[PDB]
Design a protein around this nucleic acid. Sequence first.
RNA 1: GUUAAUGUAGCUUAAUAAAAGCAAAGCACUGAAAAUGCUUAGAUGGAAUUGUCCCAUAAACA
Lengths: 104, 70, 45, 119, 153, 193
Amino acid sequence: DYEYGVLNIHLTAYDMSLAESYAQYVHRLCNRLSIKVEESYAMPTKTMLTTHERVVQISGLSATFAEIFLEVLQSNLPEGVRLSVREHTFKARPELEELLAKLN
Amino acid sequence: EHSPEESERRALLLKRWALFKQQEHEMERDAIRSMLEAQQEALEELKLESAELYAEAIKRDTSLFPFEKE
Amino acid sequence: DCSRASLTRLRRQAYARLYPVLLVKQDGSTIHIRYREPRRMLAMP
Amino acid sequence: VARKERGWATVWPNREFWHRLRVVKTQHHVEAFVEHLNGQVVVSASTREWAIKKHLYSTRNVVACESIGRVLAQRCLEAGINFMVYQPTPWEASSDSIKRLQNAMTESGVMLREPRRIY
Amino acid sequence: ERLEKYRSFERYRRRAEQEARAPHWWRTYREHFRTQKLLERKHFLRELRANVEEERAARLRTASIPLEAVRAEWERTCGPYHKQRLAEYYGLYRDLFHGATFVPWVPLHVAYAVGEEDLIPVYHGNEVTPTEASRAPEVTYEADKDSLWTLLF
Amino acid sequence: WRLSGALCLQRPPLITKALTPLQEEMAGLLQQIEVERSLYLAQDLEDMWEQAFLQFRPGARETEADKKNDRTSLHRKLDRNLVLLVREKLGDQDVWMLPQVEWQPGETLRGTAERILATLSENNMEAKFLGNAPCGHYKFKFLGVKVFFFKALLLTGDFVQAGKKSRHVWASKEELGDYLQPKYLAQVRRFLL
RNA sequence: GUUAAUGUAGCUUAAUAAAAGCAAAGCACUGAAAAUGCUUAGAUGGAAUUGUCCCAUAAACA
């Protein structure tokens, strides 16, 4: 019994809109599957012309759940869009106020 | 500027497109569910034959990822 | 299916007209992409 | 001269109404009610009613709201309830369908705002 | 954490109002203060769905409904029950029969004739001035042959 | 008891199928709205370049157009996934079977699964295992027997000896029912994509 | 046939006074998601009384 790490997905595509369109789709599929997405960060342009890369963070997987997820990603891929899966490495007043009580 | 008939044609095909996607999503959602149940059914089957093998198998593979393929 | 997310539209509030062009890969596959000028084809070197 | 509840200052909506209009949009159908403070419904117009269904095309629609509102108003006039209280939410108030429904009631003669109590 | 969280205000409101109706242990404000018809019904619906003109008006948001047709159909189907609510709401069943309740079934119709051009109807809860009620009203209630009656006002 | 293991290999489809006409028309609709939202001879050269692409042959979306019969070849399908499927002869049976190999309790399913990958294909194929959980188990009797069906994905494949004397066939779904009649072998579709 | 699944629409022990609610899907709105607005598809393949048969028909036995 072990729990998967949070694995980032860098979606690199020629067109920002296509990368965004695929980025949203995995997120909605992730949301439907109950996959939490913490961030949807964007990488800078790949200056040489340029290409646009978008992050969809995925946190939490299971052995059976991971297998069923990834092949679906292969199917979902429009083709010509380059997938990637990688293991991942300010606070407001309510968070700080609660944090004081725990250590006080 | 589009004429009302032009909008009517585009809206009519839009209705068909929305219906088609709803049909597509429903079929795919059930397909994924069925596959997982079959995998869960596959999990059960060998458990009857030998549960001890699963003790090692049910553990996730830490080294499986990262996996990249487009 | 790969067509599940293939059909997509721009998420930009402002943008010049984008023209369709196809990028030829070295394995022969083709991809529909949006380019600023009315080019017809692109080739990967 | 009858009493209207004046408290519930910390809660929304206010309860200073002799009668209230409740419009509920479910997946199927759309219902409009008139209920007294005691909790008894007096006049009810629903899209789940046989007579309205046969003369409409879809259970949920913008026109549906309009049509059910017109049907509700005639029953409201029939029942003699001329003054009523409606408490829409900000988005619901801005919703075009609800705006049209209110227009039907105003045209029908049902006043969506009750008069002040006499002390 | 297992349960989902309301993503919209309306979901909580609908849950809350339904929650309020249910009785509870703690004190609360409320305490102190046939088949053939189905098949025929379905068939008519399908015909209405098929009609392209119905779709076009709906998508053009210009459609409308005939109130009179609905009213007569409403009388046949559930008008008795709604009429019962008004009678209970107005206190008729408690002041008349000492709490006994009877569902009205005969679609009784009464109207006070004003001159000859038009006649004021008398629905449930309607407002009629005494001047309008000076003379006796016309009554048509669709008895059918036989079945003697008594009318009491 | 007869201990037997097997592997249900998966090869991803390289190239997509063509879009449906409803999908095509929607592409026009997203384009026409794009023109509406848009913000305001090199064309001859581009026309010269486009025909240069047309004359130059690209790899077909499906590599069957030339083949039409190369089941033994790894690239049987490009639009859909493939499953390794090899004719086998048993002591009391001669049936078209999913790749099988002999397994021991000491050896884990992946270890046998890894051996299945190269034992019956004898090639430099690249395949990966995601979970040690198996996907199918079927028992056929004449003497008790059981076959363990695993699942794997082909990362890449350099299928040497394309013309083997064996009848290895890559099937997606059409040949699964045609070649595997009994449910014990025709139910492989349940855990197949 | 032995065993044994199975007949409101994903779900409900919603409903026989009126075939329901929820879940679920598309488009628009630009950080994503959500929300909001406008739109979408459906049922009893059944008799049984409470608050199982018997069929459609699924199989291990056969």
